[PDB]
Design a protein around this ligand. Structure first.
Ligand SMILES: OC[C@@H]1O[C@@H](O[C@@H]2[C@@H](O)[C@H](O[C@@H]3CO[C@H](O)[C@H](O)[C@H]3O)OC[C@H]2O)[C@H](O)[C@H]1O
Ligand SMILES: [Cl-]
Ligand SMILES: [Cl-]
Ligand SMILES: [Mg+2]
Length: 350
């Protein structure tokens, strides 16, 4: 059968779904999703600034279509995300003159947003990313407007609110590069200090935006262990593997430059050679060996897309590259990495 049944006894197999896919209108992705995944996450549609215009006004079409889809196919559904510094309008934070509104006023906007959003899907969504990406890459609390107006209380109040709205909801914190030493620890710290405040939190999302070579598997492992120790369920939430030239490690004189589209940084436009098909299978296989090792700690592994043609890495971090990060190709056909992963479970020894 599919991924989901292969991994039934391990964890949920999930896909982020764009709004075209959430519409139901692609029978070929319906057939695929129904076979392969049992968990879905809205890739964009339940984000503050996508869901609401700059005046706080709500359009629920896509948000509603996504919940109709998972109800329809009976898939576990993750809300993404109540409180985040990205894809949210500056009018949330700032007067037209640039100045920041009071904390009190922003609290009120947060109350309303969580109350309406979690409230509306209370009991339909099993899980929420309540706060997304609150630790800076300099390993300090990210200097978002959330943070600058509110402090730790934006995260605190966000969870407490969420939990009051849907008591039943599994409530996560979600971040990227927390596979990595340094930011892993600053996040463990962050949870700890809020958990001693009594903040209701149930899960820790590891985004899992990985590269073909890095981070190493020992890294990821340390993080699975650190976070579960905080008495939380571990999720891999935005899984994909970047197979393109990295701009992450570039010399000074090229901080951008580095985001500009350049030929050589897009080397596989004519197709992914077999030699890299293979590095990608092997890298997915290492990851999933790891995940199986620790499936007492991991509740779910979600991919940040269904197929390559629809991966966000085609445009991040350089617009318009041809990447190959996911299990299904641009023709919806499964890739070498896919069979390696069925095989792990198929041939498993007990
Ligand atoms: O390719 C163009 C564009 O990218 C995609 O939407 C993007 C989302 O996938 C992206 O998701 C975040 C990835 O980082 C973290 O996991 C974070 O938690 C996610 O929200 O968000 C930015 C979007 O531009 C679409 O495929 C398409 O619109
Ligand atoms: Cl979308
Ligand atoms: Cl090639
Ligand atoms: Mg339901």
């Amino acid at each position: 059968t599919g991924l989901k049944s292969a991994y039934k006894d391990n964890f949920l197999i999930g896909a982020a779904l764009n709004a075209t896919i959430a519409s139901g209108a692609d029978e070929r992705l319906n057939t695929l999703i129904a076979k392969e995944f049992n968990s879905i996450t809205p890739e964009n549609c339940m984000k503050w600034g996508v869901l609401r215009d700059a005046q706080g006004q709500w359009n629920w079409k896509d948000a509603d279509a996504f919940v109709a889809f998972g109800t329809k196919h009976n898939l576990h559904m993750v809300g993404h995300t109540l409180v985040w510094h990205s894809q949210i309008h500056d009018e949330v934070f700032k007067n037209a003159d640039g100045s920041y509104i009071s904390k009190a006023a922003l609290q009120k906007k947060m109350e309303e947003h969580i109350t309406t959003l979690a409230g509306r899907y209370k009991g339909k969504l099993a899980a929420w990313d309540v706060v997304n990406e609150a630790v800076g890459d300099d390993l300090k609390m990210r200097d978002s407007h959330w943070y600058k107006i509110m402090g730790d209380d934006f995260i605190y109040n966000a969870f407490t609110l969420a939990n009051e709205v849907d008591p039943k909801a599994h409530l996560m914190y979600n971040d990227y590069n927390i596979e990595r030493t340094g930011k892993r620890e600053a996040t463990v710290e962050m949870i700890e200090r809020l958990q001693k405040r009594g903040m209701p939190i149930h899960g820790l999302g590891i985004q899992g935006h990985l590269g073909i070579d890095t981070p190493p598997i020992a890294e990821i492992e340390k993080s699975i262990i650190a976070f579960a120790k905080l008495g939380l369920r571990v999720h891999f939430t935005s899984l994909d593997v970047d197979v393109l030239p990295s701009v992450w490690e570039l010399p000074v004189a090229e901080v951008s430059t580095r985001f500009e589209y350049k030929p050589e940084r897009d080397p596989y436009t004519k197709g992914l050679p077999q030699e890299m098909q293979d590095k990608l299978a092997k890298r997915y296989e290492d990851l999933f060996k790891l995940f199986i090792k620790h499936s007492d700690k991991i509740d779910r592994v979600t991919f940040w897309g269904v197929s390559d043609d629809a991966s966000w890495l085609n445009d991040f971090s350089i617009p318009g590259r041809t990447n190959y990060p996911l299990l299904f190709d641009r023709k919806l056909q499964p890739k070498d990495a896919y069979f390696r992963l069925l095989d792990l479970k198929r041939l498993e020894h007990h």
